[PDB]
Design a protein around this motif. Structure first.
Motif, PDB file in Angstrom:
ATOM      1  N   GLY A  75       1.031  -1.636  -0.002  1.00 43.42           N
ATOM      2  CA  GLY A  75      -0.053   0.322   0.045  1.00 43.42           C
ATOM      3  C   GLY A  75       0.625   1.687   0.116  1.00 43.42           C
ATOM      4  N   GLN A  76       0.653   2.486   0.898  1.00 44.39           N
ATOM      5  CA  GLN A  76       1.608   3.287   1.417  1.00 44.39           C
ATOM      6  C   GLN A  76       1.914   3.929   0.080  1.00 44.39           C
ATOM      7  N   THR A  77       0.759   4.677  -1.584  1.00 44.49           N
ATOM      8  CA  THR A  77       1.163   5.436  -1.895  1.00 44.49           C
ATOM      9  C   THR A  77       0.793   6.761  -1.429  1.00 44.49           C
ATOM     10  N   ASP A  78       0.636   7.240  -0.023  1.00 45.97           N
ATOM     11  CA  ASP A  78       0.796   8.417   0.220  1.00 45.97           C
ATOM     12  C   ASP A  78       1.564   8.765   1.699  1.00 45.97           C
ATOM     13  N   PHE A  79       1.582  10.015   1.691  1.00 45.47           N
ATOM     14  CA  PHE A  79       1.867   9.798   3.188  1.00 45.47           C
ATOM     15  C   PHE A  79       1.625  11.228   3.900  1.00 45.47           C
ATOM     16  N   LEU A  80       0.447  11.789   5.351  1.00 43.92           N
ATOM     17  CA  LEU A  80      -0.047  13.177   5.428  1.00 43.92           C
ATOM     18  C   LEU A  80       0.815  13.609   6.911  1.00 43.92           C
ATOM     19  N   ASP A  81       0.530  15.190   6.386  1.00 43.28           N
ATOM     20  CA  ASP A  81       1.033  15.555   7.038  1.00 43.28           C
ATOM     21  C   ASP A  81       2.518  16.061   6.836  1.00 43.28           C
ATOM     22  N   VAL A  82       3.298  15.843   6.103  1.00 41.62           N
ATOM     23  CA  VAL A  82       4.478  15.938   5.965  1.00 41.62           C
ATOM     24  C   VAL A  82       5.212  15.512   7.296  1.00 41.62           C
ATOM     25  N   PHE A  83       5.659  16.744   7.648  1.00 39.40           N
ATOM     26  CA  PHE A  83       6.508  16.399   9.186  1.00 39.40           C
ATOM     27  C   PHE A  83       5.472  16.700   9.854  1.00 39.40           C
ATOM     28  N   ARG A  84       5.611  16.273  11.306  1.00 37.44           N
ATOM     29  CA  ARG A  84       3.624  16.041  12.099  1.00 37.44           C
ATOM     30  C   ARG A  84       3.825  17.666  12.059  1.00 37.44           C
ATOM     31  N   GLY A  85       4.658  18.831  12.358  1.00 45.70           N
ATOM     32  CA  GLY A  85       3.753  20.352  12.904  1.00 45.70           C
ATOM     33  C   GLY A  85       4.294  20.716  11.041  1.00 45.70           C
ATOM     34  N   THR A  86       2.879  21.436  11.158  1.00 44.70           N
ATOM     35  CA  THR A  86       3.181  22.270   9.856  1.00 44.70           C
ATOM     36  C   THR A  86       2.829  21.705   8.702  1.00 44.70           C
ATOM     37  N   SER A  87       3.734  22.318   7.428  1.00 40.89           N
ATOM     38  CA  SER A  87       3.141  22.049   6.193  1.00 40.89           C
ATOM     39  C   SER A  87       4.904  21.865   5.316  1.00 40.89           C
ATOM     40  N   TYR A  88       4.877  21.156   4.356  1.00 38.16           N
ATOM     41  CA  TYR A  88       6.019  21.178   3.098  1.00 38.16           C
ATOM     42  C   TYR A  88       5.858  21.855   1.965  1.00 38.16           C
ATOM     43  N   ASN A  89       7.051  22.407   2.141  1.00 42.39           N
ATOM     44  CA  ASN A  89       7.663  23.156   1.160  1.00 42.39           C
ATOM     45  C   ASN A  89       7.991  22.812   0.088  1.00 42.39           C
ATOM     46  N   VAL A  90       6.784  23.121  -1.460  1.00 42.34           N
ATOM     47  CA  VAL A  90       6.841  22.084  -2.355  1.00 42.34           C
ATOM     48  C   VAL A  90       7.728  22.756  -2.737  1.00 42.34           C
ATOM     49  N   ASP A 105       0.296  19.616  -1.878  1.00 45.33           N
ATOM     50  CA  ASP A 105      -0.144  20.200  -0.593  1.00 45.33           C
ATOM     51  C   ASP A 105       1.164  19.831  -0.108  1.00 45.33           C
ATOM     52  N   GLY A 106       1.507  20.749   0.884  1.00 48.78           N
ATOM     53  CA  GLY A 106       2.525  20.252   2.053  1.00 48.78           C
ATOM     54  C   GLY A 106       2.765  19.534   2.569  1.00 48.78           C
ATOM     55  N   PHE A 107       1.170  19.624   3.493  1.00 49.92           N
ATOM     56  CA  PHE A 107       0.983  18.660   4.307  1.00 49.92           C
ATOM     57  C   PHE A 107       0.858  17.675   4.202  1.00 49.92           C
ATOM     58  N   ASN A 108      -0.339  16.801   3.403  1.00 53.71           N
ATOM     59  CA  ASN A 108      -0.272  15.708   2.665  1.00 53.71           C
ATOM     60  C   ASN A 108       0.732  15.545   1.699  1.00 53.71           C
ATOM     61  N   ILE A 109       1.520  14.167   1.465  1.00 57.52           N
ATOM     62  CA  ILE A 109       1.430  13.901  -0.301  1.00 57.52           C
ATOM     63  C   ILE A 109       0.589  12.499  -0.401  1.00 57.52           C
ATOM     64  N   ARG A 110       0.988  12.019  -1.631  1.00 52.96           N
ATOM     65  CA  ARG A 110       0.789  10.994  -1.921  1.00 52.96           C
ATOM     66  C   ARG A 110       1.551  10.935  -3.803  1.00 52.96           C
ATOM     67  N   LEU A 111       1.494   9.089  -3.689  1.00 52.05           N
ATOM     68  CA  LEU A 111       3.017   8.328  -4.154  1.00 52.05           C
ATOM     69  C   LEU A 111       1.774   7.562  -5.108  1.00 52.05           C
ATOM     70  N   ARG A 112       2.499   8.014  -6.783  1.00 56.19           N
ATOM     71  CA  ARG A 112       2.006   6.520  -8.217  1.00 56.19           C
ATOM     72  C   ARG A 112       2.687   5.569  -7.143  1.00 56.19           C
ATOM     73  N   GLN A 113       3.262   5.619  -6.132  1.00 53.98           N
ATOM     74  CA  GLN A 113       3.744   3.811  -6.173  1.00 53.98           C
ATOM     75  C   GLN A 113       2.996   3.730  -5.018  1.00 53.98           C
ATOM     76  N   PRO A 114       2.734   1.577  -5.107  1.00 48.92           N
ATOM     77  CA  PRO A 114       2.831   0.797  -3.658  1.00 48.92           C
ATOM     78  C   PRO A 114       4.435   1.567  -3.012  1.00 48.92           C
ATOM     79  N   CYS A 115       5.238   1.238  -3.782  1.00 53.95           N
ATOM     80  CA  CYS A 115       6.622   0.702  -3.539  1.00 53.95           C
ATOM     81  C   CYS A 115       6.740  -0.258  -2.790  1.00 53.95           C
ATOM     82  N   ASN A 116       7.236  -0.716  -1.818  1.00 56.76           N
ATOM     83  CA  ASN A 116       7.108  -2.533  -0.937  1.00 56.76           C
ATOM     84  C   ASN A 116       8.007  -1.611   0.135  1.00 56.76           C
ATOM     85  N   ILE A 117       7.529  -2.799   0.849  1.00 58.66           N
ATOM     86  CA  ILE A 117       7.732  -2.836   2.838  1.00 58.66           C
ATOM     87  C   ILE A 117       9.124  -3.284   2.485  1.00 58.66           C
ATOM     88  N   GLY A 118       9.736  -2.498   3.704  1.00 65.78           N
ATOM     89  CA  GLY A 118      11.807  -1.744   3.525  1.00 65.78           C
ATOM     90  C   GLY A 118      11.711  -1.166   1.757  1.00 65.78           C
TER      91      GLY A 118
END
Lengths: 218, 251, 200, 218, 218, 201
Positions: free
Chosen positions: C122-137, C175-188
């Motif tokens: 799974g894991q095609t996205d990651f939320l809040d980026v760094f926990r506080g505030t936003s990512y800088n695009v 968006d800074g906070f949440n990002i997504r990725l086209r890939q499921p990638c892989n565990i590890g």
């Protein structure tokens, strides 16, 4: 300066409470100032002249050895006298944080008294008797107590020491607790004995003067 | 960017001279002749290469006592009363030599990053404890639901107490107005949820409104209410509950 | 200005100031409302440094900020000199980090790193980026340990980036906070994301 | 109430430690209560009755001027007596944080003793002798020490003051340090002299009683 | 250990300042140790032996009842003597934080003295006189003062107590404040009276010895 | 470099009565009879014109001693037992007249938006020193919607719907009022932010 002043005390324990010693004080064994640091507090680490030693020094100074003759014209034995007092109690025990007849503790002149809400001063005193027993049983500041003869709400009280004890009237739980001083305490220490009377005519007096020689029996 | 420390803290314990017989260790052990050397250099406390503190707000304490040491600043100042040999004031030497206390009493912080050596003068008992508490980041405070309840308090205007309406009446005919056609209204509460609620209490039905210049229906400029033109070519005169009033008692 | 007089001070545009905080705090309060004047530098400094020890307290009064959130700024910097002009976008310029003898100059942006060890597939996205505030695009940072491709000026099928939680496909804006990725990638296979951020 | 109670002390320095003075106490020059605030602590800023003055007052009270005759039937000079003790030591000096023969300091009843690991009590005492010299040299609580005649691990000890000193047995670094009290200290101060014996027949006694007049020589 | 040591004191108030009592101390009424916890501090909640009681005990020990005969060969009344001193003042009152002639307060040995900038020591002393009145009026440590006869910048000073008072010379506001001790204070308490002289030939002496019997008049 | 810290410490040292020579100055000198005035106002301390003690936090300290004086709130309560004249219980006065304590022990701080004033009760030695704690207040605010959206209606009324006003007229002549001197007004919504909106409606 209060900073390093307040820095101060650390350990309490008058052993560890310092004392500015008397300057040029030989009165101890013709040796050292009163309150000078002692091997007691050295062992305890405290390296300064202290309040502890100052008390025992003058204590050891004001205590005449057994058998010493005190002489006066008056004839009162040097022996100290304890203070004897009444503790006057009034009202009914009242705790509004508990139902009536609720066992509580009441501090009578610092003596805890277990009593239940609703007790008048007499029933309160009935409990006060229990505490005074402990105050005697623990031998804390109270030599003895006695019930006020004509009043249940008062108690005749006797203190261990010969010092003077004056306390403040207060009213707790609908119980007014007041101290009525009966007998003044008198200065003295140990047990003393009048040897008898010596009549003495002073050198150029006409009139013989009588003395009373008080040996120390303890 | 460094994120540094976020608080941490330091404390030192020294015992004097041979009584330790051991040298200083980290911020744990220190050793010296206490009367010989006033102050401290601190490598004596545990050091890690963030520059630790806001030097301004500096908690520097010894024994267990909070005490203002760092800088040999104090709100009393008295560098001239630093004044060893108890020459009291005025910086002129009297009795023993007075001198300006560059280090006044307690700690004199030093130069660039932080005190490089905190410069202290006071006497201690040979076993020492010195409370050095150097903060970073901040402190927030957190309360639950009371803000949203307590903060709007001055914002809004509350409903306040709700009122029952026992007196209201209604027109059973809106063509011909008035008695005989009137109907009283049963008891119910008004808790004012919106403005219209307010509007009905201030203008209950049968309220006579008069605007001077405006010909328009009040609901036009007001926005509320069903209004009828009233008393044209007619004066309003107090109706009497004393029937003896020949005109204005009986309808 | 003595540290002895007030613990605060205020307001002269063209007048230049040695600052003593030794006796105590200095809380400076500059003029405000300022019209369109701008053009006006004020001067505070350390002839002697009582900054550090008892520092500045710089207070702009509400309104036009000096910089950022307008909260009162404080200067530990031992030596310091303060050049600040009222700047036409309702602003008070402040020369960043400066003093006598020393070039501290300019500014330091902020990079931090947070590695995402991928699990569960799974894991095609990651939320809040760094926990506080936003990512800088503007500077995209994500790694498979292969460092992932640009998000880019033009989001593309070429650019492999999901961008937050898009319903299908993946979101054209980042968006800074949440990002997504086209890939499921892989565990590890670790998604290792960083930012170049303005403030910490 | 402990708050403003704990507020309390600030500066330590019993000068600055307050004292609730005795109510109606003239015993000082027929003037003021014992422990009343003095120009010493005024100069020091402390404006309250204090522990300092209370010590010197009763001190100044319990000290009879030179040449004063103390009279008893018993005949013991009023002069105080210091306490004399043994300090019993045992074991071998042991520091497991240092190699054997590691010089360390050992506090003997609060007296630092420099000794190296591996020293038995005797070698420890050998070092203890060094410290006791300082305890005498510094004149801190110890009038004199003497080696135990038949034991190297004990030391005969004498204290400066006339007070009583009782200390707790402890064992440090494989060295047990215990105090063995030899002679009791006796109350008294200064140097006194028996004038001689006065036989006195009291007024209606048959039996002549003897007195012993003790002049103060210091 | 300084932690729970420093924990210590709480309430100050030597009532509440503890005292390690003397072990096996009967000297109070043949009952309890000096400084034992008293009904005073019990009422105040403090349950430990304390500094308060220790002062009054030895106080009550060193105070001989009225009418007691003190006997010496010397003949000095036991009555204490207060210390009398000079306070030497110099310079001109100077406050650079205020204009000349600026009323300020100056603490003279802890006595506030209202004076205006520009006053020489004499005008300063003129104000010092005002404070010393209060020091007498408040009866704080100062029995009396007197103007130095030949010097306006000095003042003859008398202290309430019989203790010894030694203070440090300091210079404030361009005014040097120094204490010049005139008369030493002498130990004693209360008011005493010599009865007269008794010549006594001791038992096997050849030489008659004279005694001086000091009754306590207060 | 230094992150520094976000916080302020404040202090006073007061000397009593005449003995000062020196008037209360900033948070430097304070003068009074400690006997006379209980507490202190603070301008006599170090003050930034605002933000004393973010209300969720206080540490006020005197001597070198560290205790909760704050607000004259306490876990013992004893707002009764503040009790000048020292009657122990029930708050009913006996003997000397007893007082339910307006200020129970030590520091009270009155004021609303922040506590501009503090109150305090204790007796001290001549010289006093105080220690003061101002945290950074700024941040915490919370909670999202479903509860606060339920918070409005039962309580604080509502703005309700806003009303277009097509029938408004304005006075062209304020001495001799009205016709001919009148002006019809274009239509406008009334959303009620304040009572003035209401009042005019």
């Amino acid at each position: 300066s209060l900073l390093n002043n307040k820095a101060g005390v650390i350990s309490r324990l008058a052993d560890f409470l310092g004392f500015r010693p008397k300057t040029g004080d030989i009165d101890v064994m013709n040796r050292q100032s009163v309150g000078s640091v002692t091997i007691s507090q050295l062992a305890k680490g405290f390296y300064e002249p202290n309040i502890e030693s100052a008390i025992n020094d003058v204590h050891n100074f004001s205590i005449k050895d057994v058998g010493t003759i005190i002489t006066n014209k008056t004839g009162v034995s040097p022996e100290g006298v304890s203070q004897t007092d009444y503790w006057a109690f009034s009202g009914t025990v009242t705790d509004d944080s508990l139902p009536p007849g609720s066992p509580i503790t009441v501090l009578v002149f610092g003596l805890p008294v277990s009593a239940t809400t609703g007790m008048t001063a007499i029933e309160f005193v009935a409990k006060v008797r229990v505490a005074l027993q402990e105050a005697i049983a623990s031998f804390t500041a109270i030599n003895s107590y006695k019930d006020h003869p004509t009043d249940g709400s008062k108690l005749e009280v006797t203190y261990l020491d010969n010092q003077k004890h004056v306390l403040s009237t207060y009213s707790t739980y609908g119980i007014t607790i007041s101290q009525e001083i009966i007998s003044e305490s008198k200065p003295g220490y140990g047990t003393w004995n009048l040897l008898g009377a010596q009549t003495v005519t002073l050198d150029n007096q006409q009139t013989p003067t009588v003395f009373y020689h008080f040996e120390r029996t303890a | 960017s460094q994120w540094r420390s976020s608080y941490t803290r330091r404390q030192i314990r020294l015992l004097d001279s041979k009584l330790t017989s051991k040298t200083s260790l980290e911020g744990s052990i220190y050793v010296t002749d206490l009367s010989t050397m006033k102050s401290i250099p601190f490598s004596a406390f545990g050091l890690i290469p963030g520059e630790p503190i806001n030097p301004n707000s500096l908690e520097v304490r010894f024994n267990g006592i909070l005490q203002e040491l760092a800088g040999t600043v104090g709100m009393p100042l008295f560098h001239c009363v630093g004044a060893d040999s108890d020459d009291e004031v005025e910086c002129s030497v009297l009795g023993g030599t007075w001198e300006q206390s560059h280090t006044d009493y307690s700690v004199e912080t030093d130069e660039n990053g932080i005190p490089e050596i905190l410069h202290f003068d006071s006497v201690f008992e040979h076993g020492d404890i010195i409370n050095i508490t150097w903060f970073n980041n901040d402190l927030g405070t957190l309360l639950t639901k009371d803000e949203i309840i307590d903060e709007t308090d001055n914002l809004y205007v509350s409903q306040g107490p709700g009122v029952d309406i026992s007196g209201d009446v209604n027109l059973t005919d809106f063509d011909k107005i008035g008695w005989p056609n009137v109907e009283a209204v049963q008891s119910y509460q008004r808790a004012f949820n919106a403005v219209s609620n307010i509007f009905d209490t201030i203008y209950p039905i049968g309220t006579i409104y008069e605007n001077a210049v405006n010909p328009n229906n009040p609901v036009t400029y007001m926005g509320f209410g069903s209004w009828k033109l009233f008393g044209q070519g007619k004066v309003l005169v107090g109706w009497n509950e004393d029937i003896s009033d020949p005109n204005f008692a009986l309808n | 200005y003595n540290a002895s007089s007030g613990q605060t001070l205020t307001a002269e545009w063209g007048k230049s100031y040695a600052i003593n905080t030794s006796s105590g705090r200095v809380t400076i309060n500059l003029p405000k409302g300022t019209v369109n004047d701008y053009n006006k530098v004020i001067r505070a400094r350390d002839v002697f440094a009582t900054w550090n020890v008892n520092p500045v307290t710089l207070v702009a009064a509400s309104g036009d900020t000096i910089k950022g959130s307008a909260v009162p700024v404080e200067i530990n910097v031992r030596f310091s000199d303060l050049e600040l002009v009222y700047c036409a976008p309702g602003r008070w310029e402040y020369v960043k980090n400066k003093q006598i003898d020393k070039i501290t100059s300019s500014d330091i942006s902020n990079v931090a790193r947070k590695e995402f060890l991928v699990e569960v597939q799974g894991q095609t996205d990651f939320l809040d980026v760094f926990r506080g505030t936003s990512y800088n695009v503007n500077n995209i940072r994500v790694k498979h340990r292969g460092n992932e491709l640009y998000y880019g000026d033009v989001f593309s099928e070429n650019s492999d980036f999901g961008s937050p939680g898009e319903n299908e496909g993946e979101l054209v804006p980042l968006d800074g906070f949440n990002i997504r990725l086209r890939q499921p990638c892989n565990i590890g296979d670790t998604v290792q994301i960083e930012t170049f951020m303005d403030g910490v």
